[PDB]
Design a protein around this ligand. Structure first.
Ligand SMILES: Nc1ncnc2c1ncn2[C@H]1C[C@H](O)[C@@H](COP(=O)(O)OP(=O)(O)OP(=O)(O)O)O1
Ligand SMILES: Nc1ncnc2c1ncn2[C@H]1C[C@H](O)[C@@H](COP(=O)(O)OP(=O)(O)OP(=O)(O)O)O1
Ligand SMILES: Nc1ncnc2c1ncn2[C@H]1C[C@H](O)[C@@H](COP(=O)(O)OP(=O)(O)OP(=O)(O)O)O1
Ligand SMILES: Nc1ncnc2c1ncn2[C@H]1C[C@H](O)[C@@H](COP(=O)(O)OP(=O)(O)OP(=O)(O)O)O1
Lengths: 673, 673
């Protein structure tokens, strides 16, 4: 019943020694943890050869790519991995990896893969042919300079791989059947699956023969809520719809028995016209979209609300409904004061900066509220009848440490390797049950790259989080990031000579995206910021012009490059902070079982106590301006999370909302208190 | 509650497949045993250096001798050990080593030393300076060509001799000193046996008042209580003593409450005069030895019974007692029919072949009934009074496989290494509570070498156990063994120039022991026997003459060389039979717990079923003649064990006893039925 030694040592840090914390004990706890639990459950082997032979003959490793080299080259790779003599810096830095991510045995009671093992297996998977490139991946990963995404880091060479799926539901019975089918298919693959209910007819409407026959959106939500309980995502909705009130009555603290969704989140799509009507204090008109489909032939949100709203008001054909926008934003503020639900996307900020609006305009987002790409709906006909295949969105992920990049200045080569890595991942991927995801993943070739460790590095260097210097720093940094990113994409496009489809329809072929960079140079405006990037080259606008010419030579290989995800579950292995959202508390406290695990933030010393500010004690406006400065280079959304208090006000909340709409923040997240 | 896989596979052998046994399953069980229990409890390490550093800093290895080399030489030794790719041949071949002998952890739940580890640590302990000699010890041990004794194999480099022989002089102070030394050695775990020759008997005068002595039974009672306090030996007695009947009434199936010894065994010393009196059917006279001590000044068994028996009969001073010898041997046969107790030593067979009778004559033996050396009694005076130190016997052990010696023909170099090994062991030994053991172990330098695996090798080659060919084979083999043994002892005596004390008093300096070997050559008398030793040199009697001259040059380093012990507890690791006693059953069956472990004898196939005879179905006379042929070269005793049946007869038993006395067998053991 006694608590073991390392947990007891980890509980020692809260003892006040001269008003401080016992940080130096922490390593000792880690030095306990590698003696009394880890090195007494590892399966023992003589050497490498039999080890790998035992790993093959019990159905663990996919033996194909592990047969495509010599034994000696793999031995050199493992030798390069063990030559680091790597150590962990913190207590959770081991515990989150040797409990869940690292490979266990069949009885789930022993440990096979060491920390070099998993990384070097990932390295040979990203190699696909070159030994020295695999060594480059090792030197990239073992210095904690790059982190692949969660399911890629889990399921490399075992018994799918991308945790993000985005679909559309056309309007038929057959379409709803196909949608529930594909959701149950992807549900066992563990990824993130979110739907959208734009083009559906509303409640109390005619079904092809008889008026007032449709049970509406709530029944489809009920079927999906039962559907994900069998094997957890969300769904979005554009606001110009009668049942939007019933779409928002689901998340309710006085929850109805039938109106009860504990699985799916919800979210609202809002263009500028509704914002205008809520500002100027006038009426609003939600519609019956099936009447619009009968009238104009198209669907509702496939046209501009700013161009067509009063025209639908003027049509006697479209049955309408008048409501109050201001009371509706008040109700949104109340429901976000309850929890923070739903989600919010401002599409006009997105499409006016989007490159690929010539295919379609972005209407929705994933569960992770980040990926904003084109989406064409399919049409699933009857059994012997053939179908028509639209386009879908499937985004594999991956971020990186800012800190070690700043330590080593190999940021270019870092992007060079990570781009090829995610490229080979999207090469490898195949799903054999949803054909539109198949066609789009072959077609669009969308990769997603981001970064964590913003708060901690700049807080450890002694720069406040609300400083303008950090905003200029992030501006110059992400400018150079996007520069080398497009540079590598153009290089690979020259290597293959095969861009994505309808490349001339993009703004990339015209250089309209490049028109921001031909002027308005992003040189550092502070000396202390300039000392940080001091020691390496920073490009000029003429380098952007040479880049524009080199793009105009061939083109770009990818259609999307960047994403920012709240990668907290693999934040702990990199032993760092979250992404760009600053930290909540200086000390995290968990109870694994009969235990009080005490996690300090990395870099917690006496001097930098003030730069480790608290999330409840910050200027939200400067945070939004930081995220807007970050937004200057990112194609997709940014995982912006609101940090609130009970003492705050929905007046101030909606002021922050309209402030972010005025700045141009794409999406937000669930709010915390 | 389910039986694990390897035990279930080991129980499969008794299934009759075509009237046979499932031998081929057995390896599979062993191949199970190294997957599901062993390789999932070994503490995992990166490489050698940290491993040894962790082993030092937790008080496991004595760090002195493990600091007397380079790291690289130790790495070469471990590399030579792992270069064998050694495997076990049987199921118990692992289970008796990874359960008790190999090193565990502090919580006794994990395993640190592998099978290479223990052997190579023993190798560096026997090295004491030379790397190549340590590699020679590795090449000796890892081919299973030599096995050191049990406590040396256990306690090398941790926190050493299992055989102690003492004498008890006659005072109160002496009995105090005896119980003191027995309790001192009792925590050291060795074998300790006493002897009660020079004590006065029951009902006798204690220095002032007649009929005051409680006798031998009270001292036995104190020793029986004494060994119950710590982590069990025995005691011997010469037969010419009144209380011998009470000395034999202790081991009784109708056991008295007071007369009850469940700890100490007992044993009888018999010279030729009592054998003569029992043959010729006359009277016998046991004595009161304290009267003899008052009369002649010496003690009783320090003079010849054949020279002095009728002279003590003729003395009116010595009070005597007349008894029947024939009924006494009948009672001995009855008590051995009960269990097999007591032990029996025929000293006149021993002393007439003993080399060192000029110091004293052997009067007794150890617990293991094998070591027969000189022994001078001490005299423990009062507190401020100084004492006088006698001589004691302490024999470290060690045997070898016959089989691998026959495989490799390196018998000479084998003896060369094993002699230096036991030499360094007797160098290392020190006890700091019994001064006479200290003085004798510095003085006499007695080593003990033997052999196991007689029955199995010659049974596997297809030669019957009762054959004369095996007797000639063993004669030639042990002749060459003793030849190279004395050769190496003379070499080491030349190396040091320091023989043991009173070397000129021995028969070795006079060559009287060598007079057997100057003639009567032991050439093989059979062709099939000659093919076995074919391929190597066998010496001649002129080589014995050169040996005699080389001995006469310097001398011999040791005073004793050979011993034969029932080394069953380390028989299983060598994966072989016992020593020269043939096997009891073809299959051993044990119950570890909720289990039926089935051990086959090694080499059990269909063809050699007949040469694997049964111990209850053999000629005892040919066994005694085999042991007498073995006795032709051994200085000490031989662990001869009787194998009896309930259908046998004490008439036949006593006939076998007198037959062995007529042949010249030194000692016997407890009998089995
Ligand atoms: N933070 C850690 N990360 C990884 N392994 C660790 C960590 N802490 C301890 N260990 C591992 C390494 C070793 O196998 C064992 C402890 O040995 P360790 O002392 O850490 O290495 P070391 O040999 O380089 O230092 P030293 O020479 O002082 O012993 O457990
Ligand atoms: N029995 C039903 N109960 C509720 N809703 C239904 C039922 N049958 C059909 N629907 C709903 C869901 C469908 O998306 C929608 C129209 O159904 P469906 O017959 O598949 O369309 P359709 O392609 O045949 O022609 P139309 O565009 O005129 O509706 O109404
Ligand atoms: N009898 C045994 N003695 C010692 N180790 C054994 C024994 N049986 C199995 N093992 C050990 C050796 C390995 O660490 C593991 C089993 O691998 P094992 O197959 O025996 O060796 P191997 O690699 O030489 O043969 P193979 O190439 O066919 O796999 O457990
Ligand atoms: N109180 C006693 N009860 C029983 N036995 C005793 C007792 N005292 C002494 N003895 C026994 C054990 C001794 O070995 C033996 C003689 O005792 P002890 O006085 O020590 O001999 P001693 O050296 O003084 O002279 P002596 O040779 O005449 O006996 O008798």
């Amino acid at each position: 019943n006694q608590v073991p030694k390392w947990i007891q040592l980890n509980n020692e840090i809260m003892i006040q020694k001269d008003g401080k914390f016992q940080f130096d004990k922490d390593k000792e706890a880690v030095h306990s943890y590698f003696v009394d639990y880890i090195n007494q459950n590892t399966v023992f082997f003589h050497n490498l050869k039999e080890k790998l032979d035992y790993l093959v003959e019990n159905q663990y490793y996919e033996e194909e790519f592990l047969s495509l080299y010599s034994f000696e080259d793999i031995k050199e790779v493992f030798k390069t991995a063990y030559a680091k003599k790597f150590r962990f810096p913190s207590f959770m830095s081991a515990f989150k990896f040797y409990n869940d991510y690292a490979l266990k045995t069949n009885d789930k009671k022993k440990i096979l893969e060491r920390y070099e093992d998993r990384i070097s297996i990932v390295a040979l998977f990203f190699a696909n042919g070159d030994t020295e490139k695999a060594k480059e991946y090792v030197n990239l990963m073992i210095n904690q300079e790059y982190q692949p995404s969660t399911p890629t880091f889990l399921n490399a060479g075992r018994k799918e791989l991308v945790s993000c799926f985005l679909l559309e539901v056309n309007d038929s019975l057959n379409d709803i059947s196909r949608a529930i089918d594909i959701s149950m298919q992807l549900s066992k693959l563990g990824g993130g699956v979110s739907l959208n209910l734009s083009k559906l007819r509303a409640k109390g409407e005619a079904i092809k023969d008889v008026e007032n026959a449709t049970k509406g959106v709530v029944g489809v939500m009920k079927l999906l809520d039962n559907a994900f309980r069998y094997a957890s995502g969300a769904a979005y909705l554009n606001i110009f719809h009668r049942d939007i009130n019933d779409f928002l009555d689901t998340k309710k603290i006085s929850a109805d028995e039938d109106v009860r969704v504990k699985t799916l989140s919800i979210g609202v799509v809002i263009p500028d016209k509704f914002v205008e009507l809520a500002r100027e204090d006038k009426a609003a008109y939600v519609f019956y979209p099936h009447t619009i489909y009968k009238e104009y032939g198209q669907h509702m949100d496939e046209m501009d609300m700013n161009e067509m709203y009063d025209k639908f008001v003027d049509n006697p054909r479209v049955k309408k409904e008048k409501i109050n926008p201001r009371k509706l934003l008040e109700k949104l503020a109340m429901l976000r004061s309850e929890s923070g639900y739903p989600y919010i996307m401002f599409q006009d900020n997105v499409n006016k900066v989007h490159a690929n609006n010539h295919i379609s305009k972005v209407k929705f987002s994933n569960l992770c509220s980040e990926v904003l790409q084109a989406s064409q709906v399919s049409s699933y006909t009857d059994y012997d009848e053939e179908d028509e295949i639209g386009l879908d969105i499937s985004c594999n992920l991956g971020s990186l440490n800012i800190l070690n990049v700043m330590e080593h200045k190999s940021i270019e080569k870092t992007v060079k390797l990570a781009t090829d890595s995610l490229t080979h991942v999207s090469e490898t991927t195949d799903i054999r049950n949803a054909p539109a995801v198949r066609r789009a993943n072959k077609a669009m070739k969308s990769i997603g790259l981001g970064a964590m460790n913003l708060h901690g590095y700049l807080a450890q260097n002694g720069i406040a989080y609300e400083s303008p210097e950090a905003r200029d720093f992030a501006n110059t940094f992400f400018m150079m990031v996007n520069f080398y990113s497009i540079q590598r994409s153009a290089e690979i496009a020259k290597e293959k000579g095969e861009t994505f489809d309808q490349y001339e329809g993009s703004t990339y072929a015209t250089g309209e995206y490049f028109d921001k960079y031909v002027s308005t140079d992003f040189s550092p405006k502070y000396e202390k910021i300039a000392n940080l990037f001091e020691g390496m080259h920073i490009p000029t606008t003429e380098d952007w012009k040479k880049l524009k010419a080199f793009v105009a030579e061939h083109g770009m290989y990818h259609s999307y490059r960047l994403c920012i995800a709240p990668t907290g579950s693999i934040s702990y292995v990199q032993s760092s902070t979250a992404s760009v959202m600053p930290i909540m508390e200086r000390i995290e406290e968990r109870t694994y079982g009969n235990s009080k695990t005490y996690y300090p933030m990395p870099g917690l010393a006496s001097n930098n106590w003030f730069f480790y500010k608290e999330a409840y004690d910050m200027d939200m406006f400067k945070v939004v301006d930081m995220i807007a400065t970050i937004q200057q280079h990112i194609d997709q959304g940014i995982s912006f999370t609101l940090f609130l208090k009970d003492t705050m006000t929905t007046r101030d909340l909606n002021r922050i909302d309209l402030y972010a709409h005025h700045r141009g923040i794409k999406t937000i997240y669930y709010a915390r208190t």
